[PDB]
Design a binder for these strands. Structure first.
Lengths: 109, 145, 65, 110, 131, 38, 121
RNA sequence: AGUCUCCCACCAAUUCGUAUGCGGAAAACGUAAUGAGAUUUAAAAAUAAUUGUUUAAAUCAACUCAUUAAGGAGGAUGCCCUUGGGUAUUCUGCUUCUUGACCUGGUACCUCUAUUGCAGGGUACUGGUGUUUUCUUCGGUACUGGAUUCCGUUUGUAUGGAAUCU
């Protein structure tokens, strides 16, 4: 049903960052008509996708992606220290993202 | 190397042998007049003895000895007149011919033995029996209108 | 205690293990199933052959020569 | 030509002819292996999936699942023009020579 | 009050560790074994939490309540049902039933002490800073 | 030892389809050893 | 003018697809009967109530035929609903010997009438 | 077919971090060059699996065990060939580099328990067999079936929290 032109590229988080494969929000499933697919051919963020492509092509950013590749023990320690957070009302099994001590990974689809 | 068994499904059908009474011509009417009921004097050892007598009378001595080694009636109830007899795969045709050559019961006369399904497993036999019982209800529901 | 000592090791007895803990099992079964606890049919399904695995040995391993 | 990477000396010493995918051990423990063209790819998983791939990945509608293929063996070249700060008039002719002018069109460019 | 529940829980943790050490090599590749390992790790975490509470010579810690309530909502509500379903499926299979029944009984008994301490210290939970 | 046997029979009638088989084919071990194999 | 037609958007969650037969224009009659019987038997173990039978365009006639077959043959309640289906068509707009497949594309919506046919047990 | 073995979740590492003749993810797995051996032996018999006979014991053939780490360069010998080049064997010798058996004590620095001596953890260094006689599993993380509903959001995170039934 989708058209030929469909390429979605962005910077994703580490796959080991997630604990369980949680599904995305599924509440607008019924209200999916042809207008959205018609607008998909118009609305397209060329700039960010091109930036991700240039980051993947350039060998300097591709190496910087390996800046701080945390180990399974470090991820387990982060999951264990998040057991005691400041909001003492909700259980979080995942781990938050950091703008300094975390590697940005570029994907292409 | 492996004992191959084969079960035979047979049914007792009573034809409406009455020339003084006119009959209705349709599907479910003749299905009901042919599947009326089995008489009270009906059992497993009474049908096995009758079929053994018939087999010994039609085939002979060795013809009955070769088939009577694994000739047993596994499941049969007189409410619907459907029975499952176990036999070998070598003498299955002989058992079918004996069922065909069944003349009458010692006390009950005028009946036909019809072999419907034959296979080497009881699960498929039960499945086919359930399918036939479900199919029977359709014409009944249609004719009750 | 449901377990016992021996000259060889420490062994576990299933009989007292489940006989002492019966009301807990009843409470668990009523907490899992509420309407089918009074019924008696087959609830749990057989394991798919895709998920079925095989059993290994009880030894550690064998080193190469 | 870029050479083999530096993983584990033990496993790196094994191949010596055919490179290894980053999921070699996993697939080798799941699927069968073979070496045809300077590389080691998978042939087929242990469990038979003739009718499974048909109902899952095929053009059928009853597809409740997904199939993942390790396509790391497909080699790629990234080509860029450094001769000028402008459009790829050189890559235009390069692609028109390599492939048919089907590739060198307005659609695949814009 | 806490002493009896903690003694019973760690005593059954002994049997958990023993049966795991026994049946490791036989069923390293299994789903019921993985559920058993996860349950053993959670039980060890809770038991070492309560031991840290105990040897401190007096029952007061603030992070203890928080992480105990974190693990309590994980062990009781979510992980329990899949554990029970797998433990009953592996015994419905018919390959290994004599230890599957013991596994089911062990889960049934470790759930009761968990909910017991839950209903005992719910008052402490609503007392300190939440609920 | 009647009652716990009846209870585990009611336990097998939920998982298994014929509950009286493991006792006849001797599939319910009364004892299970816990010792490193020597 | 060259114009191609893609299928219509199908958003099925997990089970609406299972108990639903999409009748094509080339789908045989007996195969449809067989798959409908399989769906009817498997519904209450899937956990649904009815079996959806969806067809649009040329297959509407034989879809209604399948419906009225099981209506009186097996004496099962049927429900017919008339719906609209929007389909996207990719057309070439005019604006070098180039293949017609690789050309500029424009999307256009087209509405068609269709029949949904639910069968009870 | 067979009471044989192993894979069918990961783990810059208490997780066989095993560059060890070759191939191989593993295998109580295949094969290659040399030497030796027969209850007088490393071990088979006349005081884990399998097979009716169940290796050998003039020579051959078959079984078991004991050695040979990957790639590049120089010299010598043998063959086609006699500018030269190719193959096989043998000696010198370099390149192939993740600050890791485990564990105890002392010293030096930093953080929490909301001043300190002291109590616990991490890292850098030195010294030692130190009762590591449980010579067979004992480390960490992971809700993997389906349906629906409630709530917060440009003040912060662009998505998160929890609930009912099978």
């Amino acid at each position: 049903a989708l058209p030929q032109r469909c390429t979605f590229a962005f910077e994703a988080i580490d796959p080991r960052h997630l604990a369980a494969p949680k599904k995305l929000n599924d509440s607008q499933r019924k209200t999916v008509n042809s207008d959205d697919i018609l607008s998909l051919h118009e609305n397209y963020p060329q700039d960010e996708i091109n930036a991700v492509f240039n980051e993947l092509c350039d060998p300097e950013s591709r190496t910087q992606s390996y800046n701080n590749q945390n180990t399974l023990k470090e991820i387990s320690a982060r999951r264990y220290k998040l057991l005691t957070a400041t909001p003492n009302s909700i259980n979080k099994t995942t781990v938050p993202f950091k703008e300094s001590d975390d590697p940005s990974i570029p994907l292409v689809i | 190397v492996r004992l191959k068994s084969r079960y035979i499904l047979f049914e007792i059908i009573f034809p409406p042998t009455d020339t003084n009474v006119e009959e209705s011509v349709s599907k479910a009417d003749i299905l009901l007049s042919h599947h009326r009921a089995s008489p009270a004097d009906v059992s497993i050892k009474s049908i096995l003895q009758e079929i053994r007598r018939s087999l010994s009378l039609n085939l002979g001595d060795y013809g009955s000895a070769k088939c009577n080694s694994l000739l047993q009636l596994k499941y049969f109830s007189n409410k619907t007149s459907t029975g499952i007899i176990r036999c070998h795969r070598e003498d299955c045709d002989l058992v079918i011919m004996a069922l065909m050559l069944m003349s009458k019961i010692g006390d009950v006369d005028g009946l036909i033995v019809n072999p419907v399904k034959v296979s080497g497993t009881i699960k498929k036999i039960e499945q086919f029996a359930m399918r036939r019982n479900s199919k029977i209800l359709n014409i009944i529901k249609c004719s009750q209108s | 205690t449901p377990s016992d000592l021996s000259e060889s090791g420490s062994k576990l007895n299933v009989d007292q293990f489940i006989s002492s803990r019966q009301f807990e099992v009843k409470q668990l079964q009523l907490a899992m199933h509420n309407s089918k606890a009074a019924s008696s049919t087959r609830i749990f399904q057989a394991l798919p052959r895709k998920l079925r695995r095989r059993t290994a040995s009880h030894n550690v391993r064998r080193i190469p020569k | 030509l870029a050479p083999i990477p530096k993983g584990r000396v033990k496993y790196t010493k094994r191949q010596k002819h055919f490179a290894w995918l980053p999921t070699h051990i996993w697939n080798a423990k799941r699927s069968h292996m073979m070496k045809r063209w300077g590389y080691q790819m998978v042939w087929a998983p242990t469990q038979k999936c003739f009718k499974l791939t048909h109902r899952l990945g095929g053009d059928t509608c009853s597809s409740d699942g997904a199939l993942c293929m390790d396509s790391s063996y497909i080699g790629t070249i990234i080509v860029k023009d450094k001769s000028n700060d402008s459009e790829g008039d050189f890559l235009k002719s390069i692609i028109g020579k390599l492939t048919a002018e089907r590739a060198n069109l307005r659609k695949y460019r814009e | 009050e806490m002493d009896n529940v903690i003694r019973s829980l760690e005593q059954e943790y002994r049997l958990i560790l023993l049966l795991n050490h026994r049946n490791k090599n036989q069923h390293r590749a299994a789903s019921w074994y993985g559920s058993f390992n996860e349950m053993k790790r959670n039980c060890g975490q809770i038991i070492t939490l309560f031991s840290s509470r105990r040897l401190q010579a007096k029952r007061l810690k603030d992070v203890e309540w928080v992480k105990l309530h974190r693990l309590l909502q994980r062990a009781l509500f979510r992980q329990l049902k899949r554990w029970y379903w797998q433990f009953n499926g592996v015994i419905a299979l018919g390959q290994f039933v004599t230890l599957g029944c013991t596994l089911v009984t062990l889960l049934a008994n470790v759930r009761a002490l968990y909910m017991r301490l839950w209903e005992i210290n719910e008052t402490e939970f609503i007392r300190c800073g939440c609920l | 030892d009647r009652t716990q046997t009846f209870i585990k029979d009611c336990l097998f009638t939920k998982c298994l389809e014929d509950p009286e088989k493991p006792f006849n084919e001797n599939r319910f071990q009364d004892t299970l050893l816990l010792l490193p194999t020597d | 003018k060259r114009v191609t037609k893609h299928p219509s958007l199908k958003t099925l969650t997990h089970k609406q697809i299972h108990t639903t037969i999409f009748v094509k224009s080339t789908t045989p009659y007996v195969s449809a009967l067989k798959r409908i019987n399989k769906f009817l038997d498997s519904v209450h173990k899937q956990g649904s109530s009815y079996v959806a039978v969806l067809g649009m365009g040329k297959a509407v006639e034989k879809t209604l035929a399948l419906g009225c077959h099981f209506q009186d043959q097996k004496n099962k309640k049927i429900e017919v609903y008339t719906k609209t289906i929007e389909v996207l068509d990719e057309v070439i707009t005019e604006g070098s010997d180039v293949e017609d497949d690789d050309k500029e594309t424009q999307l256009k919506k087209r509405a068609v009438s269709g029949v949904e046919l639910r069968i009870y047990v």
